[PDB]
Each structure stands twice: as C-alpha cells, then as structure tokens.
C-alpha cells in the first residue's frame, strides 16, 4: 500500500540519515538516503576493522532470509570508496518490506566522510543506470514489487534548524502538503542517472555593487543531491559568485564570510522552469564552531576536479521541498512550510 514515512535525523545541518532494517529477524542500521548514487551497502560482520567495529554490522548467518551471491562490490564516491561483496536479503523501510534486495557487505572503507560518519551506510536513490555491479536499487525493487501503489515518487523534507526534534523526512510513495506552501513547480529530467535537469540562469544582485552577478547565462544543468551538504558549481562561476559575495578563499575549498555583515548579503537566485528560486543569506550561510569560536561559511563551493554541474545539496533542499517522480521522470520544487 504505502506511503511510507521515513524519519531523518539532522546532524549540524551537514548530514541527514535514518533507520532501516535488514534480514529476519530485523538487524537495525542507520543510512544516508542519497539521490546522488544508486547502491545500498552496510558494514559486514566479516569485517573487524575499527571502522566496522564502531558501526552496526550485517551478519548473514543470523538471517533466515539471507541468500548468498558473492559477486564483487566496488564503488568510489567523491569523498570515499568501499569494497566488499554482494548478498541479498529483506530490506525494511517503515512498514515496507522489500524482498530479495541486493546489498553490498562492506569489508574495506576509505575516506573521512565515511569513516567518521554517524551512519552505517548509504541507500542510493538515483536512477538504475548509475548503479554499479549489476544490482537493482532499492526504490526500483519497491516499484517492481508494487509497494508504492500507482504513485512511484518519493518526496524529501529537510529541516534546516538542528535544534528541532524532527530532522526531516523521506516519504516513499507520496507528497506531503504539510511540508510546503504554494504549488509545486516541475522540471523534466534531462538525463536519467542523477536526478538531473535544466537550469535557465543563476544570478545575484547586490545593492553595494554597480553590476549584477550573472551566471549560467545561456542555461546549464543541475542535480538534486540529498547526499551532500553544500551547493557545488562549475569552479570559475562559483568562485566568481563567492567573490561577488565578499568571501575570502580559506583554505581547502571553502570560503569564509564576515559574521556581522550578513544583513547586507544579496539573495542568490536559480531560475528553473522559468520560475525564480531564491536563497537568502539565512539559507546559504552555514554556522560552524571549528577551532574555538564561530565562523560563517559560504554554502557555495568549487571542487578541485573540473566539472560543470550545479550540485544542489542540503543548502538548497531544505528551503525547497523536493519531489522525485519516477512515473513522469521529473523533479518538483516548492517553498518549504
């Protein structure tokens, strides 16, 4: 039947995760719901590294619904990598029971983002074209099993106030109007891999400068990625934007801003399906306590690997409730409520 509400925890506005179980009887885990990848994996009971011993581990020998596979599992993300092998078992999200779901049993994990994470693993929600190793993603198996009825969508709410008791929600098979106001604006998916679409323009108009900041002038492409904290952009353009905002590069990738002069910072605006989606400085300034006192980080950043996408992470997906629609292959945005 469904829909199935999945409740999320928010850690410091930079990672969101929530509960699932695997096997019979249920073995419990915490995972990040990542629209930027399409594989499920968890730490194996066969692993006895520090990393594995500090996390929840999957023990196939204790599950009566386990089925062996053993094909190799290897994936590389931006901030990490994992290696192990495939197994199949029941995967539960709220009251949904996904039978025969393949997962990676992790033996080797690299990357501080993963090693230090508060979550045990990643549950990818991207299209099946970008799954590695021949295994079908969780949502695809939910669709094959008819678990979403006739509404094969999921909708993501992220709370941008970390002191709240409710971190967020993934709603599998539904859209919840109590998380948004006005109406949803849809944009078609341009390449079915990431949740990727066309953006018309990106701009910012400061009062204290003579010229506006005009980026993505002839249009560009973006993705909605729940698996990352910030907004990433093409390096030349995102650097120009951070400069226009008065930031200073310091040091490894992130720009810093003056924590007094925030009132005057202009809005940053993404135009999508001809509608303006504006971020205020309250939305895009991240507050951090690293090295004693308190800093104001720009939520816009460039990677050292050249790449052309605007990657809309948690900074964007908090103020805009997002609908990921597999029936119609479209993304919907609406002002958060």
Defining key terms:
337 residues, mainly beta, Cathepsin D, subunit A, domain 1, 6-stranded mixed barrel, 4-stranded antiparallel beta sheet, 26 strands, hydrolase, monomeric, Putative cathepsin d
Q: Could you explain how this protein is built, in words?
A:
With 337 residues, this protein is mainly β. It folds into two domains: 1-175, Cathepsin D, subunit A, domain 1, CATH 2.40.70; 176-336, Acid Proteases (Cathepsin D, subunit A, domain 1, Beta Barrel). The protein is 10% helix and 44% strand. The chain contains six helices and 26 strands. It has helices at 50-53, 112-115, 138-144, 235-244, 281-284, 314-317; strands spanning 4-11, 15-22, 27-34, 40-43, 67-76, 81-93, 96-110, 121-124, 153-158, 168-172, 185-192, 195-199, 201-204, 213-215, 220-224, 231-232, 248-249, 255-257, 268-272, 275-279, 285-288, 295-298, 300-301, 310-312, 320-325, 330-335. It has a six-stranded mixed β-barrel. The longest helix is centred in the C-terminal third of the chain and has 10 residues, at 235-244.
